[PDB]
Structure formats: structure tokens, C-alpha cells
């Protein structure tokens, strides 16, 4: 969030209206989510034996 505000401060000094800055971030937010959604794959095809492995993978990251 602060990174968006740091790049917005440079655009305000250039004379850009703040609403035009907010309108650009909303359109760019959906383009990033739709791009990452196509890259990921579905792991639900695996059985319960492999499904436990994916739970151990994301656990060690948050720990």
C-alpha cells in the first residue's frame, strides 16, 4: 500500500489528478489477478496422500 502511495506522490507532482491515479490502479489490479490466475494449476486431481504434501509445503512457509 505504501509502495502505491510512493509512486503516486511522484505522479501528483507532475500534475496528474488524484482520481486519474486511482482509476489506473483499479484497472491494473484486475489485470494482475487475471494474469496470475492463468499461471497457477489445480492440485485437486491428486489423491489424499499427495494432498497432505501440499499442506506441509505451505505450512513451513508461514512458520
Amino acid at each position: 500500500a505504501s509502495a502505491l502511495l510512493d509512486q503516486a506522490l511522484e505522479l501528483i507532482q507532475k500534475g496528474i489528478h488524484p482520481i486519474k491515479i486511482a482509476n489506473g490502479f483499479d484497472e491494473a489490479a484486475k489485470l494482475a489477478i487475471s494474469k496470475l490466475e492463468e499461471t497457477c494449476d489445480d492440485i485437486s486431481a491428486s489423491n489424499d496422500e499427495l494432498f497432505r504434501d501440499f499442506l506441509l509445503r505451505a505450512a513451513k512457509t508461514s512458520l
Binding site: 489528478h17 488524484p18 486519474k20
Partner: protein
């Protein structure tokens, strides 16, 4: 006659403001314009908060 002071009677209780003169009704106009100053930039979809 009850004292050498003999105070002068004031029509209104102490603390009351004044009026008439020149610019009394103008004071009410500048009060609404100053409040309007804050609501002007909030008008329009590109307005601020």
C-alpha cells in the same frame, strides 16, 4: 439618589453582541461562503473528500 455612583442602565444584559452599522448582514454572507469553500472541491465524480 441612594448613592453617588448612579449607574447608567443598559438596555441589554452584559455579554450581548452588537448589530446594525455597516456589514452586519455581510458577516452572514461570508460565513456561508467559507462553508461553501469546503464543499466546492467535493462536487463532481473527480472531486475530493
Amino acid at each position: 439618589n441612594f448613592g453617588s455612583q448612579t449607574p447608567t442602565i443598559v438596555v441589554l444584559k452584559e455579554g450581548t453582541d452588537a448589530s446594525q452599522g455597516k456589514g452586519q448582514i455581510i458577516s452572514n454572507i461570508n460565513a456561508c461562503v467559507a462553508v461553501q469553500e469546503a464543499l466546492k472541491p467535493t462536487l463532481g465524480p473527480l472531486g475530493s473528500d
